[PDB]
Amino acid sequence: KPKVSLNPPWNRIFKGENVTLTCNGNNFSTKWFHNGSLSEETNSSLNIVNAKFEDSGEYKCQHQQVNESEPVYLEVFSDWLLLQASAEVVMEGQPLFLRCHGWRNWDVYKVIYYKDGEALKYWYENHNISITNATVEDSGTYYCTGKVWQLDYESEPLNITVIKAPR
Ligand SMILES: *[C@@H]1O[C@H](CO)[C@@H](O[C@@H]2O[C@H](CO)[C@@H](O[C@@H]3O[C@H](CO)[C@@H](O)[C@H](O)[C@@H]3O)[C@H](O)[C@H]2NC(C)=O)[C@H](O)[C@H]1NC(C)=O
Ligand SMILES: *[C@@H]1O[C@H](CO)[C@@H](O[C@@H]2O[C@H](CO)[C@@H](O[C@@H]3O[C@H](CO)[C@@H](O)[C@H](O)[C@@H]3O)[C@H](O)[C@H]2NC(C)=O)[C@H](O)[C@H]1NC(C)=O
Ligand SMILES: *[C@@H]1O[C@H](CO)[C@@H](O)[C@H](O)[C@H]1NC(C)=O
């Protein structure tokens, strides 16, 4: 029962960005499955360079633990704004991180986050928001808006569900 982790953390990235996938920490060869297809990659870390839409999908890893890991889903976008989340499924009590990310890392200003239409009441800083103690109420669909260069943009919406800690 290994686990795929990403670095950076975001599973929603921009076309052309990089993301590294690592199979669990007890592993000191690895088997990777992209959309259920055995990869040619055998190291404990899978590197996705200059992300393609094709790289989107389900990724599972396999170590000498005779049991594949839970899947992880990657999605590549091309837009001016992209709402990134630490997780699309957060356990109650854990933190939830959101980031209104701009294409090419352009600076984003006047960042506003929305949850089910309503603009977030929580207090937050520019383009990086931290929700420390996730609650069932933090479930909802989110998206953000911000000013890039001289115009105002809006990211695609994302759905975030908060489940209970137990099993
Ligand atoms: C793995 O499976 C996923 C299905 O969840 C595949 O993702 C889909 O891939 C396409 C690109 O092939 C994504 O982009 C679309 O492509 C067209 C043509 O290039 C583009 O013009 C559209 O604007 C659109 O972006 C599509 O969004 C994507 N779906 C998701 C949910 O990410 C993926 O390609 C599969 N990879 C392999 C190697 O099988
Ligand atoms: C992200 O979450 C939202 C809401 O949680 C999803 O949109 C909602 O989708 C449901 C169906 O899954 C819509 O309800 C349906 O309405 C039709 C017509 O009245 C009815 O016949 C069906 O029985 C069902 O009740 C609902 O209106 C819609 N809400 C909104 C605000 O659009 C959305 O699909 C999710 N996105 C993804 C990618 O999962
Ligand atoms: C991704 O990594 C490669 C080197 O492995 C680098 O040349 C490229 O600039 C990186 N892409 C981004 C968007 O940083």
UniProtKB/Swiss-Prot annotation:
Residues that carry a glycan: 18, 35, 43, 67, 128, 133, 159
Gene Ontology cellular component terms for the protein in this record: cell surface; external side of plasma membrane; plasma membrane
BP GO annotations: cell surface receptor signaling pathway; eosinophil degranulation; immunoglobulin mediated immune response; mast cell degranulation; type 2 immune response; type I hypersensitivity
Membrane topology per record: Single-pass type I membrane protein
One GO MF term: IgE binding
Domain of life: Eukaryota
Major localisation: membrane
Tissues showing expression: Expressed in eosinophils.
All ranges on the Extracellular side of the membrane: 1-167
UniProt keywords, alphabetically: Cell membrane, Disulfide bond, Glycoprotein, IgE-binding protein, Immunoglobulin domain, Membrane, Receptor, Repeat, Signal, Transmembrane, Transmembrane helix
Membrane as UniProt keyword: yes
Subcellular location: Cell membrane
Positions of the Ig-like domain: 2-78, 79-161
UniProt key word Hydrolase: no
Disulfide-linked positions: 23-61, 100-144
Subunit structure: Tetramer of an alpha chain, a beta chain, and two disulfide linked gamma chains. Interacts with IGHE (via CH3 region).
Job description of the protein: High-affinity receptor for immunoglobulin epsilon/IgE. Mediates IgE effector functions in myeloid cells. Upon IgE binding and antigen/allergen cross-linking initiates signaling pathways that lead to myeloid cell activation and differentiation. On mast cells, basophils and eosinophils stimulates the secretion of vasoactive amines, lipid mediators and cytokines that contribute to inflammatory response, tissue remodeling and cytotoxicity against microbes.
Name of the protein this chain belongs to: High affinity immunoglobulin epsilon receptor subunit alpha
Annotated source species: Homo sapiens
Coverage span on the entire protein: 29 to 199 of 257
